[PDB]
Design a protein around this ligand. Structure first.
Ligand SMILES: CN(C(=O)[C@H](Cc1ccccc1)NC(=O)Cc1c[nH]c2ccc(O)cc12)c1ccc(Cl)cc1
Ligand SMILES: CN(C(=O)[C@H](Cc1ccccc1)NC(=O)Cc1c[nH]c2ccc(O)cc12)c1ccc(Cl)cc1
Ligand SMILES: CN(C(=O)[C@H](Cc1ccccc1)NC(=O)Cc1c[nH]c2ccc(O)cc12)c1ccc(Cl)cc1
Ligand SMILES: CN(C(=O)[C@H](Cc1ccccc1)NC(=O)Cc1c[nH]c2ccc(O)cc12)c1ccc(Cl)cc1
Ligand SMILES: CN(C(=O)[C@H](Cc1ccccc1)NC(=O)Cc1c[nH]c2ccc(O)cc12)c1ccc(Cl)cc1
Ligand SMILES: CN(C(=O)[C@H](Cc1ccccc1)NC(=O)Cc1c[nH]c2ccc(O)cc12)c1ccc(Cl)cc1
Lengths: 221, 221, 221, 221, 221, 221
């Protein structure tokens, strides 16, 4: 990450050993479960592209996922370049250049070059931009590596309602969808796929009911 | 959380790796037991809304609970908006806007926007306000996920009094109630549901007696 | 705890994650054994009332003990109020009020209000005062939860003297008593309840003898 | 690593105990798997040659690897000396000398001498240069210690496609090759060595297809 | 321990959670083995008397040892008072008093009073003085709790010489003695109590020989 | 270690709890294996003699080794004194004295005296000098405690060449020798003691060959 010198030359801050270790263990224990993402995100706050690649480099295994991820990164980088075309040729001595897609992703850019973009008036936050791309990729991986669909989540004859909701919302968090879409799945599937006894109860509460209410309503049954 | 630059531009402070890890393990080990709340609260002191969502995002499992929690968050946000209506249209260049319910909760607001509200003369402490909402929600979850009622806590024939009190006060901490209500449960249930031998002793101490006294009184028996 | 800004506005310092964790594990492993107290005390140095309640809130289980503790806290708070009566009515705009028993204990006082009292010329150290109350309560709990009395500590026929002393001093540390009282128990019980063979030796050293001497004297036997 | 004094004499910063420990455990758990390198690299950011040797010295076992590594280091040092020949004889009192290959590698140079080179206007980043050499060596070790070739990675009759890709990309990361070469292996081997049923599917997607697409295409089969 | 404010009012520094934990675990794992002392000493560098008592308070068990330790502390405190008699009566408003034996040990002195003594021109280092007393006591405990005497350390018929020396020097470190005395035990016992075969070899090296030499000399045998 | 005050009086920095713990565990797990030394060295960077003795004091067991180590320390101290003779008698009030061998080793010198030497214009780096002595001693211990000689390292009929090299270089690192000597052992033993099949291959590569080459050459066989 970045921080200010005594003299106020802007200076890079090495990633902590325990930030590194955190990220690795996360991955070893949790694979690509949706919570992985807010964690990757939280451990990389302030990161430059170099820092972000470091972090990604430290994952061993899961190399299929990692490759999809680069594909995702290339698609965004291409798109960046299309919306921000580079004026080429000579470069004005000492002054900074405009980052291409590759420069953002860290392939074609030095650390020194990166800090330069990030700490500018006005600042070009290349680390933030790269992180969006990564997280977009991380989402795709999560969706792909999810064993079941929201459509196949039905409540068991003997399943307490709390647990059915737990699997519905767990699965739903892993899905490909806008908020409009998730609402629609909630609104359509959740009660439609409850078990008979509790479904009757819930038809009868009508569609203003809170979860807290639905759950309490189906507690005794 | 937030802290002051060398130049005194107010700057965000990334959440520690061990704060993150703390919170996760808490949840894995203790579920929603009442002590979870003072811990969530203690690990989020100084937090912005982003920080608070991060923390919440890092919980995997318990997704029913998490959804009730959002419901709680929406109810408070709505109520906020009702008591603080936004003047809309154009916004004065450079100056900050008035946070809506959604802006407080972090849905419709940037980190930069948040720090801005929090560090103002006078400061609009959006992080503190969001935390109230969350904790209100966390309480509801705790109550709901409590296996037994204060009414069913009776002292065993062979139960030492210390243990009965331990279950009474454990259960009571999980209950829905003001202080007026808890006092009333204490004052009515605690002795009424002791076991025969010790109940006699306690009728005989009368209602000024301390716990220390009650416990000592029923020690030998 | 508290610390000074760059600008020297006095500012609150969030409790460390590892301070929190320390305290919890202590309690899980050691219950209310006398060493718990110097540890609670050491982990709460610099604490405000809020900090102290946080810490207390994080204990799950032991809720009987916790309730005795509040009782203890109320008794001290009442007594505080009796010796420091509050002048009521309006309050002078901007200036601080005199803390009541409840304000010290954190029930009726904000963090901001607390720091205000603590960092005053001259400082009203409300955190220190609350901590006395707590520790007084913690002592009562320790005494109460001690399985055996100093009177029942006798040396075994086959018990090395070092071990008997170990149980005597362990038990004695858990007892209700001034220093005058502990001395008297030492001076009366320790040798009176040694086993026959070693008692003879010790009668014969006379009452100026050090522990080091007594122990060495009864080493071979 | 290096940091600035109160007086701004540039001063060495001892390696953290947990940086040390990190590196050792990495090696004990992961041997020379490709992820080792980004980790060595991340734990040595800011390092001087001394720091880098320290770190290398702390590995026990793997001494064959360590010797190849020195060989690699000598080859680079020789080459350095060939492209940067030293003007010899007397040295100007007080002023710094030009580092030879050996001085970069830390054999013939003091810490004080190193900091001197690193913190110069303009700075001679000897630590960065040595690190390139090491990492070049570390790569060679990784390749050598890889049990299988990219050529022998075939998909099992019963192997899900995700797993085959996982072994292909794991093995490919361990290989000797430029990016041109890896692309060529990908482009030639990956589909050519899938199992029959899925190969047919993939011939039929044609060579623009993403991994995400290929994987999804072969999901049901 | 102690440190300087922004304003340079000298201020107390709370003991770290991990310093606390360190000390406790030491004791749980190692009892009173001689290495305990350099560790207690290393974890208490900079300590005030309060800090030192805290640390001592956190030991549970070993209460016989703890009592001998206080006895030791009283003997030193008495002696202090004899060599530094207090002028009594009124005290000059605001100025500091001369610490008695009890004030050094922390019984009769406040933290504020202690920092005052320690940070004076010239400084009265009460923490250093108390630590001497403690360590003197800790030594006595170590000696006492040592299972065997230097006199009973003989080399086994089948014991490698390295191991015999290991037990000799382990035992010798636990003994009551000046350096003059330890030298004499070394010089008299070490070879006199080696086993026959190796004793002959060693008589023959004569008394200038190093350990390194003695050990090498008896290697093959 | 040492650091600068706010006022720039040079001040001692207590050794971290985790530096202490690091060193102890190292020793418990790894005994005197050659990697111990770079670790002792890395954990003691910046150390004064006191700090270095502390660290050494914390080792329990291995007391034969520890005694050889002191012997080594005395030999160096004697030699120091011979090359730097002390002018004796009175000492100039306030000014510092010239450290003897004993003063360097910490026997006859205070911490305050040590910092004084270390932070002088020009600085007498007594901590660095003592550390050389120790490490010289630590080397001797390592050599002595090495179970096998470089001469007895032969490659097994069934031993992969990588493993034979691993034992050769492991053993060689533990040996008594200059670089001239190690080269000679390498150059003479390594191939001379390979197993028949691989020896033939290697005779045939001739003596310019790299390890990387030798190892690859004997891979299939
Ligand atoms: C911005 N934001 C979030 O990041 C919230 C923070 C939060 C998590 C858990 C409980 C409460 C809040 N996170 C999410 O919406 C992501 C999420 C977590 N679990 C899910 C399950 C299904 C789904 O579609 C999304 C999620 C958010 C905050 C408040 C609300 Cl009301 C909604 C979202
Ligand atoms: C403000 N405050 C609290 O947060 C106290 C702090 C505290 C916890 C444990 C022992 C002593 C004190 N916490 C509580 O009242 C919450 C609580 C903990 N256990 C309970 C059990 C039942 C219940 O209704 C509430 C609680 C508080 C402080 C002092 C008193 Cl006397 C009462 C409350
Ligand atoms: C102020 N103070 C304490 O806090 C001492 C510090 C200390 C603990 C252990 C060994 C030596 C010293 N602590 C105590 O007196 C509490 C205590 C610990 N074990 C006990 C066992 C019985 C008892 O009645 C009290 C204690 C103290 C210091 C010196 C002396 Cl001589 C006496 C007390
Ligand atoms: C500079 N850089 C890297 O260091 C990337 C960072 C990264 C790792 C994992 C997923 C995404 C990105 N790392 C690599 O290319 C090394 C690598 C990791 N796994 C591999 C597998 C095969 C291979 O030939 C190389 C690698 C990089 C960044 C973006 C792209 Cl698109 C490509 C490379
Ligand atoms: C001041 N000082 C010490 O504290 C040395 C430091 C040190 C420990 C271990 C190996 C080398 C050095 N420590 C000791 O003398 C205490 C000691 C450790 N093991 C022992 C075994 C027997 C004994 O009588 C004393 C000790 C010291 C330093 C150098 C020498 Cl040569 C002698 C002592
Ligand atoms: C100064 N220096 C060292 O401290 C190197 C650093 C280093 C360790 C491991 C791999 C590469 C480099 N360390 C050593 O030479 C000590 C050593 C480690 N393993 C050995 C095995 C045998 C031996 O005789 C010495 C060593 C060094 C640096 C570069 C070279 Cl090429 C040689 C030495």
């Amino acid at each position: 990450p970045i921080v200010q010198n005594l003299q106020g030359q802007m200076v890079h801050q090495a990633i902590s050993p325990r930030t590194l270790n955190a990220w690795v263990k996360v991955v070893e224990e949790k694979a690509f479960s949706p919570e992985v993402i807010p964690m990757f995100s939280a451990l990389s706050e302030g990161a430059t592209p170099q820092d972000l690649n470091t972090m990604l480099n430290t994952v061993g295994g899961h190399q299929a996922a990692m490759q999809m991820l680069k594909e995702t990164i290339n698609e965004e980088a291409a798109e960046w370049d299309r919306l921000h075309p580079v004026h080429a040729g000579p470069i004005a001595p000492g002054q900074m250049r405009e980052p291409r897609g590759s420069d953002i992703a860290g392939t074609t850019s030095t650390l020194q070059e990166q800090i330069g973009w990030m700490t500018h008036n006005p600042p070009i936050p290349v680390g933030e931009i790269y992180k969006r791309w990564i997280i977009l990729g991380l989402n795709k991986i999560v969706r792909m590596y999810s064993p079941t669909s929201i459509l196949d989540i039905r409540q068991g004859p003997k399943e307490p309602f709390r647990d059915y909701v737990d699997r519905f919302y767990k699965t739903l968090r892993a899905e490909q969808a806008s908020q409009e879409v998730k609402n629609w799945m909630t609104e359509t599937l959740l009660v439609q796929n409850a078990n008979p006894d509790c479904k009757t109860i819930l038809k009868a509460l009508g569609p203003g009911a809170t979860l807290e209410e639905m759950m309490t309503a189906c507690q005794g049954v």
